[PDB]
Design a protein around this ligand. Structure first.
Ligand SMILES: [Zn+2]
Ligand SMILES: [Zn+2]
Lengths: 177, 177
């Protein structure tokens, strides 16, 4: 089921999420939350969603873009469940990106995050991962994990001048679209 | 006439406004702009409006609020025209306030500005003023003058965590330190 996505200003979005116990990843409550998170993320046309965004303060993140692998210019993100993630930047190098957030509807801002990170996490099967992530996925993962620390991208804007409403930003900076 | 209020993201809002001349304040063009600015401010239920907010890069600010609905706890501000304002803080002491902006619709952010300032300006009659402003008017005036410098309150947020959408900010309580 699609759940309500909390918007910026809601204190929950700024709380710290607690780790998920392996003793709860097989429960129906967890499986339901996961399904609900994917429904919500997809219905909202997002590429990622963190549990706190729907009011659950647990270190649970679902990501996934659909049909972007063969779509030029639009990076894909394989669907997956990310639990108890821990990210460590591997570089000072950053890639700027006009990020948006389901909890900050109608806006976007320029954010520069390390373009190479180390992420440790567990999936819904209890599998443990420790990989080097880069590019787009690196941005998405950091964005998502920030949520688990009560951090929104507006907290990381490169400059408040590079921030605004989608339609205003679109109509003020045109391209051959 | 009510004019369109530019939203955050529009480059104009970040430009510097030019001074208005004494001869200029007597022109019909200026008066039409003034009337339009008040119409716009009132129709939008604002307490202030700077010329750049409607696309005019001139140091023109109109203020005034009667039983304002957008800021229910604030004191009424008599309508007046403020031209070529220059503000100098007289104190380091600040009063926090959940500010909003007609150019940043649907949001509010906690901003702490000096609660005592010196403002020099000219009204539409060419009168020169040099007064000590404090309290609410001090906040409104600084907010408005910031517009003339291409500055929005989001540039002065005490903390990005104390920022969000009004609907949620009215429903929930964010504890201030
Ligand atoms: Zn987000
Ligand atoms: Zn404003």
């Amino acid at each position: 089921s699609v759940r309500k996505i909390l918007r910026m200003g809601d204190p929950i979005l700024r709380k710290i999420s607690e780790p998920v116990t392996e003793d709860e990843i097989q429960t129906k409550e967890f499986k339901k939350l996961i399904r609900d998170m994917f429904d919500t993320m997809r219905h909202a046309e997002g590429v990622g969603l963190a549990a706190p965004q729907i009011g659950i303060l647990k270190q649970i993140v679902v990501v996934g873009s659909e049909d972007n692998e063969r779509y030029p210019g639009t990076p894909d993100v394989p669907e997956r469940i990310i639990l108890n993630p821990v990210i460590t930047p591997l570089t000072k190098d950053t890639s700027g990106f006009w990020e948006g957030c389901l909890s900050v509807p109608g806006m976007r801002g320029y954010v520069e995050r390390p373009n190479q990170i180390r992420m440790q996490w567990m999936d819904e099967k209890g599998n443990q991962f420790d990989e080097t992530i880069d590019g787009y996925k690196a941005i998405v993962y950091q964005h998502e994990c920030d949520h688990l620390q009560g951090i929104l991208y507006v907290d990381r804007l490169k400059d408040t001048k590079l921030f605004g409403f989608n339609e205003t930003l679109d109509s003020s900076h045109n391209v051959l679209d």
